[PDB]
Amino acid sequence: QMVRMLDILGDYLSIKGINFQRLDGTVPSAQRRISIDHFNSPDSNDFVFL
DNA sequence: CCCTATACGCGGCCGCCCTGGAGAATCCCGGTGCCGAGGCCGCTCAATTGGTCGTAGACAGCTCTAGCAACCGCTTAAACG
């Protein structure tokens, strides 16, 4: 519900070493399209999507 | 051999240098008078004490509306380099 908890999980996964992607209200629609097309690609190395 | 001028020491008088006792100016002390301040007394009115009573506000209860934290999404005009 809160993007600050999204920041907490994103920093946790960044220092963990897990390829993560994020989507919230601050992200513009072009980068949202980039994140969705990267996550839905068959050769995606992303594991967790926030 | 006696008189008379002649150069030489100096009794008396006057002026100058050194030291002593009497009086005057100054500091300290005691008695006394005046100004600032503190204490006491007299009046005396406003604060105190005691009681009574009304009520101002605290409290409780119910209803409706504004605010608030955190998020979204779109527009677009303002801020910024």
Coordinates of C-alpha atoms (C1' of nucleotides) in Angstrom, one line a residue:
Chain A
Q1 CA 0.0 0.0 0.0
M2 CA 2.9 2.4 0.8
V3 CA 5.7 3.2 -1.6
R4 CA 8.1 3.6 1.4
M5 CA 7.7 -0.1 2.2
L6 CA 8.3 -0.6 -1.5
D7 CA 11.6 1.4 -1.0
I8 CA 12.4 -0.8 2.0
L9 CA 11.9 -4.0 0.0
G10 CA 13.7 -2.6 -3.0
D11 CA 16.8 -1.6 -1.0
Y12 CA 16.6 -5.1 0.7
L13 CA 16.6 -6.8 -2.7
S14 CA 19.3 -4.5 -4.0
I15 CA 21.7 -5.3 -1.2
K16 CA 20.6 -9.0 -1.3
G17 CA 21.7 -9.4 -5.0
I18 CA 18.3 -10.3 -6.5
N19 CA 17.3 -8.9 -9.9
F20 CA 14.1 -7.0 -8.9
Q21 CA 11.8 -4.6 -10.7
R22 CA 9.4 -2.0 -9.3
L23 CA 6.3 -0.1 -10.3
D24 CA 4.5 2.7 -8.4
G25 CA 2.9 6.1 -9.0
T26 CA 6.2 8.0 -9.2
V27 CA 7.4 5.9 -12.2
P28 CA 6.2 7.3 -15.5
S29 CA 4.3 5.3 -18.0
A30 CA 7.3 4.8 -20.4
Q31 CA 9.5 3.2 -17.7
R32 CA 6.4 1.2 -16.6
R33 CA 6.1 -0.2 -20.2
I34 CA 9.9 -0.9 -20.1
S35 CA 9.5 -2.8 -16.8
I36 CA 6.5 -4.8 -18.0
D37 CA 8.2 -5.7 -21.3
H38 CA 11.4 -6.7 -19.4
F39 CA 9.5 -8.8 -16.9
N40 CA 7.3 -10.5 -19.5
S41 CA 10.3 -11.3 -21.8
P42 CA 11.1 -15.1 -22.1
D43 CA 14.8 -14.3 -21.4
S44 CA 14.1 -12.3 -18.2
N45 CA 16.6 -12.5 -15.3
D46 CA 14.2 -10.7 -13.0
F47 CA 12.8 -12.7 -10.1
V48 CA 10.6 -10.4 -8.0
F49 CA 8.4 -7.5 -9.1
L50 CA 7.1 -5.0 -6.6
Chain B
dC1 C1' 125.6 117.6 72.3
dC2 C1' 121.0 119.2 71.8
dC3 C1' 117.1 120.1 68.4
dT4 C1' 114.3 118.4 64.6
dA5 C1' 112.4 115.7 61.0
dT6 C1' 111.2 110.6 60.1
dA7 C1' 109.7 105.9 59.5
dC8 C1' 107.5 102.2 62.4
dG9 C1' 104.4 99.6 65.9
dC10 C1' 99.9 99.8 67.5
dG11 C1' 95.6 101.7 71.9
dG12 C1' 91.1 102.6 70.6
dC13 C1' 87.0 102.6 67.5
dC14 C1' 84.2 100.5 63.9
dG15 C1' 82.4 96.7 61.1
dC16 C1' 81.6 91.6 60.0
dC17 C1' 80.9 86.3 61.0
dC18 C1' 78.9 82.3 64.0
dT19 C1' 75.3 80.4 67.5
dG20 C1' 71.5 80.4 71.2
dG21 C1' 66.5 81.0 73.6
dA22 C1' 61.7 82.9 72.9
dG23 C1' 57.6 83.0 70.2
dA24 C1' 54.4 81.5 66.3
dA25 C1' 52.1 78.0 63.0
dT26 C1' 50.5 73.2 62.7
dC27 C1' 48.4 68.3 64.0
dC28 C1' 45.9 65.5 67.2
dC29 C1' 42.2 64.7 70.7
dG30 C1' 37.9 65.5 73.3
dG31 C1' 33.4 67.7 73.9
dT32 C1' 29.3 69.0 71.5
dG33 C1' 25.7 70.2 67.7
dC34 C1' 23.2 69.0 63.3
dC35 C1' 21.4 65.9 59.1
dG36 C1' 20.0 61.3 57.4
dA37 C1' 17.9 57.4 58.8
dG38 C1' 15.5 54.0 61.7
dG39 C1' 12.0 52.9 65.2
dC40 C1' 7.5 53.9 67.6
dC41 C1' 2.7 55.5 68.0
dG42 C1' -1.9 57.1 66.5
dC43 C1' -5.7 57.1 63.1
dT44 C1' -8.4 54.4 60.0
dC45 C1' -10.1 52.3 56.0
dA46 C1' -9.6 48.3 53.3
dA47 C1' -8.2 43.4 53.5
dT48 C1' -9.6 39.3 56.3
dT49 C1' -12.8 35.8 58.0
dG50 C1' -17.0 33.5 58.4
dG51 C1' -21.4 32.2 56.5
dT52 C1' -25.0 31.9 52.7
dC53 C1' -26.5 31.2 48.1
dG54 C1' -26.8 31.3 43.0
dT55 C1' -24.7 29.7 38.9
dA56 C1' -20.4 28.9 35.5
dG57 C1' -18.5 25.6 33.9
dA58 C1' -17.0 20.7 34.0
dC59 C1' -18.8 16.4 32.5
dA60 C1' -21.5 13.1 29.9
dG61 C1' -24.0 12.0 25.6
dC62 C1' -25.5 12.1 20.7
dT63 C1' -25.0 14.0 15.7
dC64 C1' -22.7 16.0 11.7
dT65 C1' -18.7 17.9 9.2
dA66 C1' -13.8 19.3 8.5
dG67 C1' -9.1 17.6 8.7
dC68 C1' -5.2 14.2 8.0
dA69 C1' -1.8 10.5 6.4
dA70 C1' -0.6 8.2 2.5
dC71 C1' -1.5 6.8 -2.0
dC72 C1' -3.3 7.4 -7.1
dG73 C1' -4.0 9.7 -11.9
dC74 C1' -4.1 13.7 -15.6
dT75 C1' -3.1 18.4 -17.1
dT76 C1' -0.4 22.1 -17.8
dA77 C1' 1.6 26.2 -16.4
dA78 C1' 5.2 27.6 -13.6
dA79 C1' 10.0 27.0 -12.1
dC80 C1' 14.6 26.1 -13.4
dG81 C1' 19.1 25.7 -16.1

